[PDB]
Write a protein that binds this ligand. Structure first.
Ligand SMILES: N[C@@H]1[C@@H](O)[C@H](O)[C@@H](CO)O[C@H]1O
Ligand SMILES: N[C@@H]1[C@@H](O)[C@H](O)[C@@H](CO)O[C@H]1O
Ligand code: NA
Ligand code: NA
Lengths: 573, 571
């Protein structure tokens, strides 16, 4: 039998469980004595989908409120030791994820090459140095990619920056966060914001990618978009709202406001932050996309991803300018995003990706974003009726994530999703579909998991329904547990913490970095009702094995925001 | 009953031990099997100095050569699992240490300030941006410090660069190392080389330090030297040979030589070899003119001699000019003359002329021997080579011999020291009453420079019994850093168990892939052993001695595990 727990441990006042794999009671042992301090019943959870992990039982020990080190015991079997602590993830992992970012900054020969990279199909070159390498196996740099699939665009570099700046603001009133940490976090954020600036063309649009076809060659780097697993380059590099640009604009607009925060004056200075520069860039970008967005989209049509990205842009632009103009912009985008919530014979209030909702929204990087954008909007909406209607849509959407996760046996509380394959029907699932508009792409979903963690914690301060708040706290903690080793693989996917950290291709020089997070677990390669991580048939196949162990900066960035929102809410009675 | 092992594991063909602390025989258990593959006797060991750790037993499982995961069991006590593998530390930790250096680059507001730092005592500003923060609690950047004590100067930033470049060279003939690792390694090395360039004045001397009085303030950063625990600044910032400048010249000269290596034209490129070599020569010939004037007591000592030997040897390899061979011989003769004998030891290293003050060094005690081995690669004259080999053999014997003088189950590398008001004596740890009047700390960088020495010797000497004892000494000192110590504490952050932190409550968190100062003697009892002892653990004036990270430890560990990798098939 096997006892599975969060490898690091549990937030002191958080929801707490362990999962037993076996063929009637558990004890909690205080490590100090080795004596049982609480007895708990086993709750059978039965079989999951076609995971074939056998029988499972959950052990609920939420009532354990007292800090220290502990183990779970069932019969002759014991879990590994874990910690119960206030601010546990913030205290133990936040610094390491910052060092991860700093370790992944574009530098050396790549930085040298990016000061003069060719623009695809032209003989011009541009200075786009800065930012971060995208992945443990990829020194390219991205606003987004998968644009040709239309519904799959992940927010990549700009999301890192918006998440870091968002975390910086949440931590501003935290007395226990040191100013040296603020120096480190705002440095990483503004380093990213400086890259966003360089990625902006004088007409106002942003470049989508600096892409080397995965070759690691300096001469091959080029500003472009690309398609397919073979990385066919194209001149379609103007980034539309859903292609990283709306988040970039939101990020620049938030950067422009750092002056409003007391820490900004207080910490050591060298010259002044570039505030007007960031604000002016974000405005120019925003208005240029209001005119041009359609022409930059692969199918010429805006979808839910444009509308959430543009809602963040317009919300941050309103916050930084206080101009009614941007609040009208935000209201318009909120209304379009709200109209994506729909109902059908399977689900009430799912998210639609397209206009008639025959294609559900699902998203392996950022499925919490529709809700997070409505919550950022609610922080600015002073009109009582607009606020109430929006709160109803938000509450529906939070109930949808909880209803779908709880629809089937799910001891791990893996966040479920409503999906559709290109040649399949709408159905609920644990993991994204393998047969999708890209024709190849799917991978572990840690960033999506951390985005839904961030949404569940952000709801705590936004919604009014205590019972939903309380279900969301539980949901957020089981999501967090999964990333940190409470999963069928007993595998902590935050490198440097916990046990069984997976690598990528260290034998080829492509080692995962401490502080980073990997793609993670997917469905089976042959069986989509299954579960897999580096399955034996494909584990050595370089065309496939990146789907599991490779690190990718959005997982890190979403994780960093997730734990910061957990820290904000850690005293939530 | 506690069973102590290397928390990571053991090189496949290395020396392998565990240490049982109790008041039987042992089994090795294959994890995969759940059952015993070797049965081994416990050798009893006495009490150690005054560490008060009870009685101990060692278990030698060297014979185990099958890659896999194992545990040790004695009675019902089990060790944690550990790994046996070929090139274990290289495959498991080398990448992390490079990420640690990149995470420690001077950046943001400090980089901005360092483009216009004032020279102490004047209003002249200079651009000395780049390099690395020296420690997890210090954003100052250093060639060296402690210059006022004369005998304690550590090689800091320059040593990172020379170690990485030397590692890059060792790895050139290793087919299993990937080119992308080469890209990353040489990038961090030449990043450091670029900083060494900016730290050189037009006249040819290097600045010793960019120092903020530990304030973290951008306004307080200035080019200077400083003295005492209060960090009083002075305008004595010209670096003599022992104050980082010898090794910086060595590093610049090595950097100029990269195009001789086939990987350098093979790997991706974009964008200074003659510039590095010109700086090295200029710095060298400058200090052959000015050195004594930059030294606090105006007298050169063993440290100048090993740092200048490194400089001149590298300059000879990069230029093939005879005067540089002549220079190396001269420094090699000076260095060799520091090996002295007295009533306590044959063939100890003397810091001063008469040997009344022995050499001991918390950052770099392997350097006298290393610099002679470097010199041995270039010496074509048979009788000089032969005389040098014997002094190097006597030095290597001295290290083994002093280490085993006394009960030492952990094989902690011992040393010949002298306190300012005391007599010459062997000890485990450096003395607390020394010429600085305050400074002493864990010795991880020293430990790893002696690992580096032990493995470098494998290719240099001829004596197979000494080669053999060196391999064993090297693996035991490796074990100590990685958790086979009385604290059951791995000091490489992100690996093993019980990693120590520094001051995370104040935002000075230790970094993954870095190595902390480590274990010392007791605060009150220098015959004791301590790490964050109760009485001083929360006192910010004292606790940096244990948990703080410092870049020489990581740089010496990086080179040590690369020399182990070179020698990993040496039985
Ligand atoms: N271009 C790829 C992405 O498609 C992938 O999602 C990421 C993480 O594996 O690696 C980048 O190299
Ligand atoms: N100036 C101090 C050193 O003297 C000390 O050796 C190192 C590591 O603790 O920290 C630096 O901040
Ligand atoms: Na486009
Ligand atoms: Na000097």
């Amino acid at each position: 039998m096997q006892l599975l727990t969060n490898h690091l441990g549990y937030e002191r006042l958080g929801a707490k469980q362990a999962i037993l794999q076996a063929q009637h009671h558990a004890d909690i042992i205080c490590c100090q004595s080795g004596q049982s301090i609480m007895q708990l019943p086993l709750q059978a959870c039965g079989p999951v989908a076609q995971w074939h992990i056998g029988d499972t039982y959950s052990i609920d020990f939420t009532a354990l409120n007292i800090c220290g080190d502990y183990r779970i015991r069932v019969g002759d079997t014991e879990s590994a030791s874990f910690c119960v602590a206030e601010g546990l993830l913030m205290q133990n992992t936040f610094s390491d994820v910052l060092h991860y970012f700093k370790s992944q900054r574009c530098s050396g020969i790549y930085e040298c090459a990016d000061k003069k990279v060719p623009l695809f199909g032209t003989n011009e070159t541009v200075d786009v140095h800065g930012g971060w390498y995208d992945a443990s196996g990829d020194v390219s740099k991205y606003f987004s990619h998968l644009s040709y699939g239309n519904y799959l665009n992940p927010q990549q570099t700009p999301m890192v920056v918006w998440n870091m700046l968002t975390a910086y603001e949440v931590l501003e009133d935290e007395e226990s966060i040191a100013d040296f940490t603020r120096v480190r976090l705002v440095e990483e954020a503004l380093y990213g914001a400086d890259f966003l600036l360089r990625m902006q063309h004088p007409q106002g649009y942003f470049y989508m990618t600096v892409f080397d076809k995965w070759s690691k060659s300096t001469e091959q780097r080029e500003v472009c978009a690309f398609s397919t697993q073979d990385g066919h380059k194209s001149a379609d590099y103007q980034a539309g709202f859903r292609q990283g640009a709306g988040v970039a604009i939101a990020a620049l607009a938030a950067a422009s406001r750092l002056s409003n925060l007391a820490s900004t004056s207080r910490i050591p200075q060298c010259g002044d932050i570039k505030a007007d520069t960031y604000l002016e860039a974000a405005k120019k970008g925003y208005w240029h996309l209001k005119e041009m967005n359609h022409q930059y989209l692969d199918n010429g049509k805006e979808n839910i991803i444009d509308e959430y990205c543009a809602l963040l842009a317009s919300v941050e632009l309103y916050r930084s300018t206080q101009e009614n103009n941007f609040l009208a912009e935000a209201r318009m985008w909120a209304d379009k995003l709200m109209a994506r919530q729909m109902s059908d014979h399977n689900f009430a209030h799912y998210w639609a990706a397209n206009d008639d909702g025959s294609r559900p929204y699902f998203h392996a990087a950022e499925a919490g974003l529709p809700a997070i954008a409505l919550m950022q909007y609610l922080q600015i909406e002073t009109h009582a009726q607009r606020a109430e209607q929006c709160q109803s849509v938000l509450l529906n959407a939070l109930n949808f994530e909880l209803s779908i996760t709880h629809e089937v046996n799910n001891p791990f509380g893996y966040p479920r999703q409503y999906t559709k394959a290109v040649n399949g029907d709408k159905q609920s699932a644990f993991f994204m579909p393998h047969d999708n508009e890209t024709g190849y792409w799917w991978q572990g979903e840690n960033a999506r998991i951390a985005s839904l963690i961030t949404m569940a914690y952000m709801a705590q301060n936004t919604i009014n329904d205590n019972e939903i708040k309380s279900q969301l706290m539980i949901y957020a903690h089981r999501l967090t547990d999964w990333i940190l080793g409470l999963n069928p693989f007993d595998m902590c996917m935050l490198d440097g913490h916990g046990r069984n950290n997976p690598d990528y291709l260290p034998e080829l020089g492509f080692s995962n970095a401490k502080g980073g997070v990997c793609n993670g677990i997917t469905s089976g390669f042959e069986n989509e009702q299954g579960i897999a991580f580096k399955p034996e048939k494909q584990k050595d196949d370089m065309l496939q094995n990146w789907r599991w162990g490779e690190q990718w900066i959005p997982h890190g960035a979403w994780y960093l925001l997730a734990i910061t929102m957990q820290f904000k809410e850690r005293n939530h009675v």
